[PDB]
Nucleic acid binder design. Sequence first.
RNA 1: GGGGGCUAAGCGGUUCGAUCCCGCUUAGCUCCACCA
RNA 2: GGGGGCUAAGCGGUUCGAUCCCGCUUAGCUCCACCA
Lengths: 193, 193
Amino acid sequence: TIKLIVGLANPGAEYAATRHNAGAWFVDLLAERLRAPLREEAKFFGYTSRVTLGGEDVRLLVPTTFMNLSGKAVAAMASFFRINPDEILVAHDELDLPPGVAKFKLGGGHGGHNGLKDIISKLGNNPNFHRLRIGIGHPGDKNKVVGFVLGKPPVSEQKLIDEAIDEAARCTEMWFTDGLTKATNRLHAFKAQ
Amino acid sequence: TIKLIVGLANPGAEYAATRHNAGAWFVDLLAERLRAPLREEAKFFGYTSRVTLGGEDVRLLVPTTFMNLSGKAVAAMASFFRINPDEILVAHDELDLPPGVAKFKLGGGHGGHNGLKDIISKLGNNPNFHRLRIGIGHPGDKNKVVGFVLGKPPVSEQKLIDEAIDEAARCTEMWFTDGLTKATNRLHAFKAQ
RNA sequence: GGGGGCUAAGCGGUUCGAUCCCGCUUAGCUCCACCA
RNA sequence: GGGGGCUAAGCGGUUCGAUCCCGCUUAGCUCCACCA
C-alpha cells in the first residue's frame, strides 16, 4: 500500500536536464500518464497531484527545495496526510545501475545520495521507505561524481533512462492493480539497450 | 577533561579470563594502581569507585550486565552524575590491533563490538566518547570471531595484553596530569613484543 | 559499520636535536571489515 | 554508507512449461564504494 510517490530534483531550469533530476523525470511522466498535471504548493515545498491508483488516494510530489532539503518536502506531506515511511516511494537517480535499468527497493542505504540522506534524516533517521532506483551509470573517476550527477546525460544515455522510466511508470501502476511481486517480476526483467 | 572511565566485560567466572573482558582488566588494574578497589552498586549495574585524578573526581565502572547491555550501566552513571559523552572513556578489546598495543580514540565506529554498539545506542545514538582500544588481534577465520573474543588468550598473547594495559594505565594517569597530547605521544609509541 | 598499515605536502607536539618518534588536516597507495 | 554482478542449496512467484525469467532466505565467489 503506497500513498506518496516522490521524484527527487534540484530546482530551476539549469538542473531540469541533469541526471540528478531522474526521479522527477519519473514523477513528471507518471503525472502525465495519470492525467494529473502537478501544481505548486508552497507549504509542501513542491509540486503535487492527487491520483487514484488501485481505488485509493495517492499523492505525487516533486520537491522544489534543493536536493539536500528534499526531506522537508517529504516530511511535510507525510506529516499532513499521516503517511508512514513504508507507504512512501521515492524515485531517484542511482549510480550503481546503468542507464536503461530501474529497480524497486525497500529500506537500506542512501549510497551517498544527498536527497535520500535528507529524507532518511527528516523522517526521523528512518530509511524504511520504498525506492525506485533509476540507473544513470557511474563516472570514470569517483572524484567527479558531483560533476557527473549535476551533468546532462548524452543523448544515448538519456534515451535509455527514458525507456527505463517509461517501463518503471507502467510497473508502478501494475504495483497498484496486481501487487509488488508482479510489478517487480516485470521491472527487474527489463533492460533497455 | 574525563569524568567516567568504563571497563567492558561479560559477567561471571567463565568470562573473566576472556579477550572480551580486556577493558575490565584495564579498569581493575587502574583501581588497584589508584587504590580504590571497586564495589558493587546495583543501580549503576556495575562495580564502581571514586578516584582523584588531576585534582578532580573521576569514577570507575565495570558493568555487571552482559556485554550487549553495557549501555544501561554507562547511561545510568552518566545520567546520575550529569556526565557528557565526551567526558567518558571506555576501555575495550580491539580486534584490529595486535596483543601488546593499545590506542586512544575519540568518536567513530564500534567495529562490530556489541559492548560499544549498546553504549552508542543508550547514550542516544552518540558515538562521541573517548576510547582505549586494547589490542587482542584477530582470528584466522572471520566466522570464528565470537569464539575468539569469548576465548582465553594463550599465555604469550595474555602477557602482551597485560603489558599494553600496564602502559595504558600509566598513560591514562598522564592524561590527567599532562594532557591527552602527551599521554597519546607516549601510548602510541608503545609496543610490547 | 567501519578499521589496520604506509606515502607525500602542510601545521602543532615530544625531543639536546628530530625530514627519524606522536597528533591533526589535505591528497594518495595498500590490506582488512560491515551491508552480504 | 553501503551497493553492483555471479554461484549453490531451500522456499515462493511468473510461465504452456521453466533447474533457463523474478523475489525472499542461508552459505560462498567476485567487482565497486563510505570511514579515508
